[PDB]
Symmetry: D2
Subunit: 267 residues, 4 copies
């Protein structure tokens, strides 16, 4: 097993399409012992997490909630047992109010909405690192999920800004994590048919932004030298497990692109 003997916390499962679900599945297949965290609808998440290869504790974590964050290391320790620490942490979380995305004009998003999006999508990467680094082993790994925001694009709007902020946060988390002998990296994935995406795609069913999204998806597979299948989160899940393993031990503050190589090609 790639992750045999490792204890890994995975946030972000909401459906069986969640990138986090597939990260969790592949990690368990590779021998990892998981602790899962979920937001809002815990009973629902439990039903999904029951479909994984193996049992795992499920803890509540709303990254907006300072009490949840303050108690997290303690609750995790209770789950994995005193004297044990985490080897990995996966941040697979994001949010942006509907005003900040889709067909909504970029200029019409109130800062209150943008700020909430940045809180959950970017700042919380630092929040989770702050909470969990004190219970991580040397050689450990923190991984977050990114969508390449180096260029602007239709529809993604303020989430692009939140991802740009996340990339910057990741470089600073790496400075802190290094003191614990821990790496911090992001995986920039290509588009995957998840609940999050269905909210975006669904919000523009018939408008120009919806058409633009479909064009972006077609262009992605065309540009990717090895192609890109939006229906398959496995290549992304494997990439996250690679960073969680001991096989990328000199990479930190960085971004690994699991996108079919699309970002390396203009056309």
């Amino acid at each position: 097993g790639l992750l045999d003997g490792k204890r890994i916390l995975v946030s972000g499962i909401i459906t069986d399409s969640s990138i986090a679900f597939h990260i969790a599945r592949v990690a368990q297949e590779q021998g990892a012992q998981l602790v899962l965290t979920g937001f809002d609808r815990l009973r629902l998440i439990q039903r999904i997490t029951d479909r994984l290869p193996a049992k795992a504790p499920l803890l509540e974590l709303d990254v907006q909630n300072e009490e949840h964050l303050a108690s997290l290391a303690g609750r995790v320790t209770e789950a994995i047992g005193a004297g044990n620490k985490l080897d990995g942490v996966v941040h697979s979380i994001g949010f942006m109010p509907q005003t900040g995305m889709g067909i909504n004009p970029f200029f019409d998003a109130p800062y209150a909405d943008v700020s909430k999006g940045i809180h959950i999508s970017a700042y919380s990467y630092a929040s989770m690192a702050k909470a969990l680094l004190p219970i991580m082993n040397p050689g450990g790994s923190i991984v977050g999920m990114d969508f390449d925001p180096s260029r602007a694009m239709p529809a993604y709007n303020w989430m692009t800004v939140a991802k740009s902020a996340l990339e910057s946060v990741n470089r600073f988390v790496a400075r802190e994590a290094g003191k614990y002998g821990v790496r911090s990296n992001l995986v920039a994935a290509g588009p995957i048919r998840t609940l999050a995406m269905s909210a975006i795609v669904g919000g523009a069913l018939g408008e120009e932004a919806g058409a633009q999204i479909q064009l972006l998806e077609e262009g992605w597979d065309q540009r990717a030298p090895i192609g890109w299948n939006m229906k398959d989160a496995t290549p992304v899940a494997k990439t996250v497990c690679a960073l969680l393993s001991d096989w990328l031990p000199a990479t930190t503050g960085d971004i690994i692109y699991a996108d079919g190589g699309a970002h390396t090609q203009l056309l």
Copy 2:
């Protein structure tokens, strides 16, 4: 005159060291007619703006204030006269609470503070574009001030994240501005001895972060193939005027580095 006949709004003057003061000075020398905006201490700003080569209207603008933003185009029109529009807009504004910078630990900044910093330093670039694009001429230019956040560094901390967000915002502002035939770009300047910097440098007088800042300054001039003088904002002011002119007409969504070429050299 490089900017002969152009009407240009300049935000961000607070002292005679302000990058905005030097942008304003050089622009007037090149024939521009200015409208200035100021925050908080208007009487003080007036005293400084009296030391410019020419007279210019001074309007109050707190970019946190939705009423100030909603009335800005109207107030500007009153200043420059009905039937007239702006050819340029300079955003030279930034803020980050003390908890988000200096020697303060990266993990100890409350999101309330980070959010305020991002509001003023990044979101407000979009706010100003939204307010002013309806009164800009085709061929016009919006310019904001940046500090290269591509890599993490000591002390700059959450302001780095705010600049990463600003770069992303600028790429989206360019999409909107293009509909008006208007360009949007940032100037990434090297370090300049201003009031803002004095707040940072001063906040660490004797701590490791203070030493790190001095090291960064020495490294900057060393790396710059043409050198770098932190005591001189003129090269930066000229670069902004270049983007405000008609001489970079095919550049938008972009970043021009006025940093002595330091970002192009490793050592």
Copy 3:
């Protein structure tokens, strides 16, 4: 005049569509005194250079030719007069054998051909800097022409590799040039209908690479927030003159994108 009183050498004129022709035209309109250099068909070039706003000396320069390079500073000095030096130098030169481009398979280009292309397109930027820096004034400017090679693309093939090398050469030329108080930068232009392009486009009239090139052109104007007109070299010529002026005095080793902002947008 933007370049009033400046003495500027411009290489690369071959037809009235040459980017160099338009750089030369705009520079003269802005008061520059030019020295032109030409390759191979000097009588032909003379006929074109006669259509510029003002007269200018024309010197032969084959950048492959070590004797031409060794005598260049001397020949230029003879042209502009003893005691006078250059304020600017424009490298607007490129070449790649047909085996290295178009529909030709990437793997089928012999190194002898690739090497010749890199010699003329990249190494010669250093050659010209070496020859001319000893006769340049402090505050001077060297500018070369680039086509963004950060990502691979159809048809451009080995020329992309040559441009990647040129970008690297430019960063090293900046180190040397800085000793003379001289800047070195590239302008990355979007596609322009020139003789060079006609050789590429023409070499694939009816093949997949030809179709791919047309798609790239359509995508360019779509992505550019201010649009892109391939029939108009003026915005590019103005950008080069901006770098030749005193208005970008803190930029060196760098690349300015005159591409309608296309490189800042994914779609």
Copy 4:
């Protein structure tokens, strides 16, 4: 074993410090069956390759030699047996004449020398891909070794240009490789004490370039959030094996930084 059952060709072994030696060692520990290639001093290389965990065929390959390249797939097939194909290929090869590096002035390198360096260090990545892709399995992986050339630096000089070219070549190799279901990536390593480096460091023992190299090494470990040990090629070897494995299946045309995260930090 990470690479259990995979057949992998590894070029570039010359001493027990060679990055390729450590790639080969770690790959064998992970169950790979290797084919090694060597240049010039085959008896010497044999003596070193005898110190690996397991036996492996050693074939002669001078990447300058068109006959060696034309016969390589045939010779490899003879080594691994008819009906068998390669799963991996490692390019760990570089060369630059002494005129192109060290204390030698950048402008004094003859193109004949630069061209030879680019041939071996960059073009040959395409040469090896061309020769070996016809005998690679789908899901296969080609990996080359890089040193981040995004910025100029002392001493590395024309090798920096060769690496910039290599990065561009890699993006085009990925386009070709994708047709075979094969990935192509580079690993950008931090500095490692090898024979190659000893040639550079040794060539400046007492000159400014030698001092600059020592400063670069100290700065590297300082900037790396997890530190950097130039005496240890293992983290780099593991990173290459990660790309050779099935665990980064959606990454191609790309660069993975095994540098302690140094390239993500300014200071």
